[PDB]
Amino acid sequence: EVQLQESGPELMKPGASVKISCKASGYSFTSYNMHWVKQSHGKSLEWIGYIDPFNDGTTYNQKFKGKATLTVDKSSSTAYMHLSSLTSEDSAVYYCAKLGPYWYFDVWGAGTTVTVSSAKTTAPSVYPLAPVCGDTTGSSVTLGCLVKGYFPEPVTLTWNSGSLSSGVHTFPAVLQSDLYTLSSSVTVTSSTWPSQSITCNVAHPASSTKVDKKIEP
Amino acid sequence: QVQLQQSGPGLVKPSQTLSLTCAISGDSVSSYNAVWNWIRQSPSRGLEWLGRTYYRSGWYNDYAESVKSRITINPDTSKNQFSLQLNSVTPEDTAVYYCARSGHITVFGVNVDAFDMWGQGTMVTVSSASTKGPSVFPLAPSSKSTSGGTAALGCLVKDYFPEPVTVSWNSGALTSGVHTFPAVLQSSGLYSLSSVVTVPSSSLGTQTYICNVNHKPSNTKVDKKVEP
Amino acid sequence: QAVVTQESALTTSPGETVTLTCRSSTGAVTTSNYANWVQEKPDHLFTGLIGGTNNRAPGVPARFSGSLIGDKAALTITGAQTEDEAIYFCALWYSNHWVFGGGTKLTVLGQPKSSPSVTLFPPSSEELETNKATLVCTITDFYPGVVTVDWKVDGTPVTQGMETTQPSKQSNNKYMASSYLTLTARAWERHSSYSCQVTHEGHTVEKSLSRADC
Amino acid sequence: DIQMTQSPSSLSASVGDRVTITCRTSQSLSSYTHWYQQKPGKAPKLLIYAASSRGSGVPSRFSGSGSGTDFTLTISSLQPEDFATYYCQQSRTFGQGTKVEIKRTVAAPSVFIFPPSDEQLKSGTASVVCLLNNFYPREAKVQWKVDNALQSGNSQESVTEQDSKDSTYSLSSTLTLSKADYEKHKVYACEVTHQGLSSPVTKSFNRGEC
Numbered sequence: 001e002v003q004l005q006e007s008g009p010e011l012m013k014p015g016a017s018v019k020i021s022c023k024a025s026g027y028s029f030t031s032y033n034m035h036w037v038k039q040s041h042g043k044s045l046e047w048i049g050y051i052d053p054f055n056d057g058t059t060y061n062q063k064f065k066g067k068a069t070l071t072v073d074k075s076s077s078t079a080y081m082h083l084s085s086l087t088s089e090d091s092a093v094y095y096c097a098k099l100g101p102y103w104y105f106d107v108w109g110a111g112t113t114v115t116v117s118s119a120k121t122t123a124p125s126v127y128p129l130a131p132v133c134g135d136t137t138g139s140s141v142t143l144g145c146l147v148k149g150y151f152p153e154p155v156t157l158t159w160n161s162g163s164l165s166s167g168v169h170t171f172p173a174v175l176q177s178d179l180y181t182l183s184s185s186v187t188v189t190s191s192t193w194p195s196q197s198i199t200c201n202v203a204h205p206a207s208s209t210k211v212d213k214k215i216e217p
Numbered sequence: 218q219v220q221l222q223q224s225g226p227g228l229v230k231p232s233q234t235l236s237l238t239c240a241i242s243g244d245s246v247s248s249y250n251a252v253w254n255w256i257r258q259s260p261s262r263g264l265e266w267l268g269r270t271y272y273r274s275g276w277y278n279d280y281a282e283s284v285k286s287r288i289t290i291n292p293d294t295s296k297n298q299f300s301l302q303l304n305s306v307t308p309e310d311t312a313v314y315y316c317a318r319s320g321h322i323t324v325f326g327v328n329v330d331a332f333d334m335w336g337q338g339t340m341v342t343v344s345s346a347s348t349k350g351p352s353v354f355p356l357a358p359s360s361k362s363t364s365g366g367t368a369a370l371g372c373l374v375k376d377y378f379p380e381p382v383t384v385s386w387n388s389g390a391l392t393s394g395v396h397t398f399p400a401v402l403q404s405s406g407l408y409s410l411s412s413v414v415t416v417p418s419s420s421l422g423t424q425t426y427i428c429n430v431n432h433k434p435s436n437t438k439v440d441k442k443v444e445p
Numbered sequence: 446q447a448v449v450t451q452e453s454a455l456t457t458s459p460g461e462t463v464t465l466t467c468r469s470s471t472g473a474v475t476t477s478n479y480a481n482w483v484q485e486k487p488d489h490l491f492t493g494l495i496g497g498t499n500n501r502a503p504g505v506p507a508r509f510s511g512s513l514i515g516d517k518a519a520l521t522i523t524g525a526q527t528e529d530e531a532i533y534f535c536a537l538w539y540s541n542h543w544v545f546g547g548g549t550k551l552t553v554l555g556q557p558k559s560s561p562s563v564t565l566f567p568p569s570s571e572e573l574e575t576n577k578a579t580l581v582c583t584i585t586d587f588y589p590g591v592v593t594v595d596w597k598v599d600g601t602p603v604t605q606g607m608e609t610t611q612p613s614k615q616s617n618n619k620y621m622a623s624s625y626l627t628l629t630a631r632a633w634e635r636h637s638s639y640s641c642q643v644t645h646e647g648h649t650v651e652k653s654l655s656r657a658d659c
Numbered sequence: 660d661i662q663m664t665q666s667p668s669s670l671s672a673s674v675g676d677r678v679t680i681t682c683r684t685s686q687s688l689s690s691y692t693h694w695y696q697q698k699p700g701k702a703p704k705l706l707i708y709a710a711s712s713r714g715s716g717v718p719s720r721f722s723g724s725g726s727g728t729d730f731t732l733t734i735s736s737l738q739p740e741d742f743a744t745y746y747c748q749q750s751r752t753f754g755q756g757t758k759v760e761i762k763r764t765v766a767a768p769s770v771f772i773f774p775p776s777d778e779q780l781k782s783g784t785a786s787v788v789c790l791l792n793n794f795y796p797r798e799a800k801v802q803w804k805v806d807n808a809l810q811s812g813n814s815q816e817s818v819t820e821q822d823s824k825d826s827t828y829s830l831s832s833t834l835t836l837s838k839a840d841y842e843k844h845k846v847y848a849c850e851v852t853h854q855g856l857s858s859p860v861t862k863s864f865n866r867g868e869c
């Protein structure tokens with residue numbers, strides 16, 4: 001059976017173009033053709049079109065005529081999808097998929113995320129999260145670390161330089177005026193804090209800004 | 218790494234069986250991506266694929282229609298080879314028989330029927346005549362331009378059956394300006410060819426010239442010194 | 446532009462038989478639509494299920510079956526299991542092209558009910574220094590993973606400023622989420638009491654915060 | 660499995676020339692369409708696979724393309740060593756093949772004659788050989804004269820394939836007589852005519868003097 005490896009995530013400004021690839025490795029005893037599919041918002045699947053690596057036939061969804069171009073390099077076993085004039089509506093995960101003689105999509109690439117944003121690289125501002133000190137009474141306490149106005153994803157957030165691992169919850173980012181904000185919260189015993197040092201270590205590699213921040217009442 | 222070594226008699230009597238073998242080096246006969254084909258070449262038919270065998274959780278065989286009814290292609294996992302058997306041959310089966318690998322060349326991981334490695338070919342003659350080994354005579358250089366210029370000398374290989382015969386000079390040492398002519402078929406029904414070379418006249422006194430003649434069908438080997 | 450319609454979501458218990466449907470906007474689904482189905486699992490793992498209306502792909506369990514039911518194509522799961530929790534898409538063939546449906550999100554209840562822990566934090570000193578303020582409402586340890594969030598300022602409902610992440614999965618297989626109330630530093634000081642409201646399966650957990658306490 | 664038509668089925672072209680061979684297939688299956696180069700007494704070598712992918716150790720000057728059911732091999736800059744027969748293929752069917760010949764300047768034959776060996780003559784036959792070496796084009800003709808009389812039989816001729824370096828041809832003619840018949844004559848000659856010669860070249864030997 002063949003395996004399909006798509007190319008890495010891509011970050012583009014409106015008006016740019018992009019070329020995603022999908023490399024087939026392994027073997028197949030029967031011929032097959034390559035379909036490309038778009039997932040929007042994580043649920044809305046859309047057929048873009050297909051190319052046949054064997055007879056060179058292509059068919060497009062009418063919505064994607066002239067936006068998308070499918071090609072193949074038969075010597076490297078690689079399919080390519082080129083998107084012209086990227087818009088916010090092109091922000092999505094793109095999958096390639098094998099359809100062979102039974103006309104079910106039996107192998108899929110893991111997908112390539114394309115993000116279309118005119119936003120600039122901005123580092124995060126990292127804020128402490130501590131309880132209202134009146135509500136100190138309780139056997140466990142939960143702290144946190146707010147990461148606001150970063151771009152682009154990703155950011156990586158740890159606790160006490162990775163030493164503190166359990167009790168931790170890092171939430172998904174929200175999109176707030178073309179920048180992302182995050183948060184991660186920890187639960188430790190009421191005796192551990194404020195007695196011990198609880199410090200979050202936020203990293204934003206895409207601006208080479210790593211930041212530490214310890215928390216007090 | 219992949220090599221194909223063909224063997225087995227080139228001369229086959231009418232109505233009898235052609236038997237050829239192709240021994241594989243640098244891959245397995247049962248490899249998941251190896252397809253073992255026989256293909257033949259004649260003037261009548263040009264290049265004609267005859268059939269294959271391949272392993273895929275059990276041996277498969279496909280044959281061309283022209284021969285479906287008298288052809289068998291069999292693998293031997295023991296010796297790592299596969300064989301061709303054609304039954305009840307007629308002169309129409311006189312041809313050069315090649316073995317060939319397919320399925321190494323793939324597009325998007327699938328076998329695309331490109332034949333990437335071929336054996337050397339066995340020349341097959343269907344005839345009831347007997348094998349006869351050549352006589353080898355010298356074509357000696359003349360006294361013309363011995364003092365300075367170019368000498369022509371050669372060997373004549375006459376009255377051999379069947380084809381082919383190979384000729385080399387000085388066991389390969391001399392190849393530049395060698396012409397080995399296509400055999401002709403004499404009215405006797407035996408073949409004859411010449412092999413000739415042009416050499417500096419000044420070498421005639423210092424360098425030896427020997428034509429090495431091989432006729433595999435009769436196990437005839439001859440090395441003939443050609444001299445003034 | 447043929448449109449393919451599937452029911453949006455469905456929640457079952459293990460052991461139930463479930464039937465998902467796939468309808469063509471242009472008229473009856475027929476054999477010549479050659480309905481196929483794929484399953485999307487977490488981590489964007491697509492695998493194909495059925496082709497040719499009713500032909501299981503290799504390795505697909507026999508509990509899965511394809512059929513035409515009336516004038517729509519259907520996928521029937523006879524004895525759903527927790528591992529069958531996924532999104533199911535059908536695609537229809539329209540002479541020369543495939544059209545995907547919108548997918549049915551299938552939840553199979555495979556763990557105890559769990560009610561949300563709600564922790565509500567105040568805006569920090571440093572963030573206040575920049576004349577901005579964000580209240581963070583962490584929602585953890587709930588199942589199933591469906592929460593409605595709601596905000597109360599001085600006991601009065603909120604309309605804007607609010608963002609809420611989608612339920613995501615925790616180390617312990619329960620669901621978490623977070624909601625934000627982004628205020629300005631003046632609006633923070635103009636009001637006293639603040640409150641995050643989470644609804645889950647019919648009950649409401651809530652937490653309050655008064656500015657006088659910071 | 661009726662051999663596919665190739666167009667043309669033969670050509671000759673000068674060194675440096677762009678050359679195009681077209682295969683008439685029955686189906687636009689580019690990836691199962693291949694080309695082979697075959698030099699004389701060699702197995703075909705895979706040249707182009709899947710219409711446009713080049714085989715191992717195939718120079719850049721060879722390229723391939725398709726359009727509908729027509730596939731084309733192009734040799735961008737014809738070289739002397741490109742003398743070959745070229746075959747297309749699709750699935751299990753081969754084309755009829757296309758012979759490519761190099762055009763070059765005219766080059767006249769060098770003529771050599773070889774009397775029979777004493778070794779042969781004891782055996783009862785006499786073979787007399789005339790060699791026409793490294794000429795171009797291929798229309799060289801040989802007449803055998805015995806005591807200045809033209810022979811209308813008793814000879815056989817054979818021509819080499821075009822040389823891979825210098826694009827010339829070579830021919831040998833062999834005149835075969837019984838020993839008895841050989842000795843009833845004195846002067847054996849071959850007379851050679853070819854475009855590169857202003858007038859016929861004759862080489863001859865005297866029986867006995869040899």
Ligand SMILES: OC[C@H]1O[C@H](O[C@H]2O[C@H](CO)[C@@H](O)[C@H](O)[C@H]2O)[C@H](O)[C@@H](O)[C@@H]1O
Nearest residue numbers: 029030031101279327328329330750751
């Ligand atoms: O289409 C189903 C068959 O696919 C393969 O066979 C075809 O394609 C091969 C190369 O891709 C050819 O060698 C062969 O002649 C074709 O029949 C597969 O080998 C077969 O098992 C399938 O039935």
Ligand SMILES: OC[C@H]1O[C@H](O[C@H]2O[C@H](CO)[C@@H](O)[C@H](O)[C@H]2O)[C@H](O)[C@@H](O)[C@@H]1O
Nearest residue numbers: 805810812813835836837838840841843
């Ligand atoms: O093939 C017929 C015969 O050819 C040769 O003999 C003829 O030609 C000779 C050369 O011109 C004459 O001298 C001779 O008298 C002819 O018979 C050959 O030597 C014969 O053995 C053949 O029968």
